[PDB]
């Protein structure tokens, strides 16, 4: 039913998007609103296949009335196959507005919960009390940063027309897009070389470590190059090069 004040000469109705949203019945003069039927997307939540085969299904932005026994209504939609609990943990699989899902032994099942920001703490502020450390710790952390990517080149005629003369003559009529494509690819490759050149070529001298590896009790064997192996790489570099493989 429509609460729209139709003038006695209009027949249809439209909106900002310019689509039909109201109509009058020819037999009985009455205004009726038209709404699209429910539709949405489906997402599947699962742990690794090595762990289990149970899954949960999320219908995005859909009321649970429209759509095994456990059904939950989140602001992201309708969740089926998961159980909700008060226990707050660190997020494992993101779902929606502060809701996460995990595979917990409880036996093993899929549960849904509200993510936890961290552990509550309260430092004791006061007028005249201070806290002073009495010891220290030496920590080592790692950071990984990409530098460059692969350089590729493309031939227009071989990719599009192969070895057909008629196709080449037809393509020649279009214009000069291939020159622009070649220019872009060449610039990309040159920039790729320049990135490594700028990052790594910082020093102008090739310094060498002394033959005796004593530095007051500090051990640098894990990062210095290993002369035994042919490629002359440190063990950490060996591990890094072995881990990353196409």
């Amino acid at each position: 039913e429509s609460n729209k004040k139709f003038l006695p000469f209009q027949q249809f109705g439209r909106d900002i998007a310019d689509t039909t949203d109201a109509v009058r019945d020819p037999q009985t003069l009455e205004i009726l609103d038209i709404t699209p039927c429910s539709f949405g997307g489906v997402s599947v939540i699962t742990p690794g296949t090595n762990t289990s085969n149970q899954v949960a299904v999320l219908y995005q932005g859909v009321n649970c009335t429209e759509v095994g026994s456990n059904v939950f209504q989140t602001r992201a939609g309708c969740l089926i196959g998961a159980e909700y609990v008060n226990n707050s943990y660190e997020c494992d699989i993101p779902i929606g507005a502060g809701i996460c899902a995990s595979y917990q032994t409880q036996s093993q099942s899929i549960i849904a919960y509200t993510m936890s920001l961290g552990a509550e703490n309260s430092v004791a502020y006061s007028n005249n009390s201070i806290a002073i450390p009495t010891n220290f710790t030496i920590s080592v952390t790692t950071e990984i940063l990409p530098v460059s990517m692969t350089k590729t080149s493309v031939d227009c005629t071989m990719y599009i027309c192969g070895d057909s003369t008629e196709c080449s003559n037809l393509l020649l009529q279009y214009g000069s897009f291939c020159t622009q494509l070649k220019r872009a690819l060449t610039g990309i490759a040159v920039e790729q070389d320049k990135n490594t050149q700028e990052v790594f070529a910082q020093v102008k001298q090739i310094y060498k470590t002394p033959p005796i590896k004593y530095f007051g009790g500090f051990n640098f064997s894990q990062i210095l190059p290993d002369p035994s192996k042919p490629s002359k790489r440190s063990p950490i570099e060996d591990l890094l090069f072995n881990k990353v493989t196409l």
Binding site: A17, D18, Q60, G96, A97, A124, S126, I130, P133
Partner: protein
């Protein structure tokens, strides 16, 4: 709710971000910069502010003999901030531009569905019920091409905008790390003047 276009909710709600901000404020008020490099250590606030004065190049007795004046100046400066934000009309234009751009892009994408692109009509339902199969493909192909081109344009624009948004977010993260969790000596990085706190 448009035609196949949906908006997804963010993972973090507003209350969670407010809790994060409150935790940062409490830490920087009760511990100084100690909680940003290890365990949080308690210290009285005037002592911390005298430490910051020593950091910028002024002795402690300058602050310890002018505590009330500094507190009054800080209180007045804080009080003026709400009025300054409310009075200026274009104070928050940067945040409004994002919403305006997103709404404009979505509206253009939706409005593009009414073009004919060289066919008898822009509605498939009538063409299906008005023509025969062996001749509807000629009309359908042009609509398909036009809508595909529109989708590609929208996707490219979204990617180009996302790059700049990521750059701004990285700058904001660096500023939060360097001006809030510590005291900076870089010129004009955490305000104009000699930086004290944020």
């Amino acid at each position: 709710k448009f035609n196949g276009l949906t908006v997804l909710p963010p993972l973090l709600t507003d209350e969670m971000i407010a809790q994060y901000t409150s935790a940062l404020l409490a830490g920087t008020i009760t511990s100084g910069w100690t909680f940003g490099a290890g365990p949080a250590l308690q210290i009285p606030f005037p002592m911390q502010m005298a430490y910051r004065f020593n950091g910028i190049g002024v002795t402690q007795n300058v602050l310890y003999e002018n505590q009330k004046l500094i507190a009054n100046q800080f209180n007045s400066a804080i009080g003026k901030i709400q009025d300054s934000l409310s009075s200026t009309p274009s104070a928050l234009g940067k945040l409004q531009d994002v919403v305006n751009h997103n709404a404009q892009a979505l509206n253009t994408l939706v409005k593009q569905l009414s073009s004919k692109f060289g066919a008898i009509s822009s509605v498939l339902n009538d063409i299906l019920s008005r023509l025969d199969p062996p001749e509807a493909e000629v009309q359908i192909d042009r609509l398909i091409t036009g809508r595909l081109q529109s989708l590609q344009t929208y996707v490219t624009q979204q990617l180009i905008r996302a790059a700049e948004i990521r750059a701004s977010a990285n700058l904001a993260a660096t500023k939060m790390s360097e001006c809030v969790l510590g005291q900076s000596k870089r010129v004009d990085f955490c305000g104009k003047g000699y930086h004290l706190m944020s």
